[PDB]
């Protein structure tokens, strides 16, 4: 009946290091290896490294052989992961994992106990409100009575941002895409909607953007454009 608790999410500058703690609650400490698994945004699971506490049996992933460091503090029964020289490839969620089931040490096991995960964001950005640009409807976004339009919510940090249409009255046909961390370290997303093309001259379309961390709120009206 073991449970793993991990330290909270962090934003880290490129070139710096990140340390993530993991404490097993309700179990032993020097029997089973703690295997770390991370997950880059949208990418597959990736084993980082594993270490049997105190016993010293450990192995780092080949890609992290020179940047990774696994240790623990025995009096606090807490293991630690340190990853140095962070780049954008190291952004993701980091999971602390373990197998459950006199005394010995076992390293080669699947992981049925998973920590909640620690989100790591590698970015040099500070808290910043977004700029809201129109995705203007045109002939290049109309097709047989259906017009597509939207709003580009670009260059904010951190997540999240909320987007609604016409103060919530417009919900059908709305697609607000997941945010993406740009090469600058600032997030960006688009929210789109499809409407009857005949409504462009009669109906107003406003995207309501709210970035709570920066206290930034923008109501942007999307107007047609000759394209």
């Amino acid at each position: 009946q073991v449970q793993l608790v991990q330290s909270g999410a962090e934003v880290r500058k490129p070139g710096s290091s990140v340390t993530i703690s993991c404490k097993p609650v309700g179990g032993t400490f020097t029997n089973f290896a703690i295997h770390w698994v991370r997950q880059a945004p949208g990418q597959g699971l990736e084993w980082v490294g594993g270490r049997v506490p105190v016993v010293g049996i450990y192995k780092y992933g080949k890609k992290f052989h020179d940047r990774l460091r696994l240790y623990e503090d025995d009096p606090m029964k807490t293991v630690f992961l340190e990853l140095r020289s962070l780049t954008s490839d190291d952004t993701g969620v980091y999971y602390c994992t373990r197998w459950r089931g006199d005394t010995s040490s076992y390293y080669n096991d699947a992981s049925d106990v998973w920590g909640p995960g620690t989100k790591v964001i590698v970015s040099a950005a500070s808290t910043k409100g977004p700029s809201v640009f129109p995705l203007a409807p045109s002939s290049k976004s109309t097709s047989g009575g259906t017009a597509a339009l939207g709003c580009l919510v670009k260059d904010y940090f951190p997540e999240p941002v909320t987007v609604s249409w016409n103060s919530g009255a417009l919900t059908s046909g709305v697609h607000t895409f997941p945010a993406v961390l740009q090469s600058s370290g600032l997030y960006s997303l688009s929210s789109v909607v499809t409407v009857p093309s005949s409504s462009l001259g009669t109906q107003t379309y406003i995207c309501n953007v709210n970035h709570k961390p920066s206290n930034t709120k923008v109501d942007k009206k999307v107007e047609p454009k000759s394209c």
Binding site: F133, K140, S141, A148, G150, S190, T194
Partner: peptide
């Protein structure tokens, strides 16, 4: 998919950047 394309807004172009969006709905 229904494919739509959007040019960058003149507002964004003033900032020195341009974003072109292709939508597959």
């Amino acid at each position: 998919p229904s494919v739509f394309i959007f040019p960058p807004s003149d507002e964004q172009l003033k900032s020195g950047t341009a974003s072109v969006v292709c939508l597959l709905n």
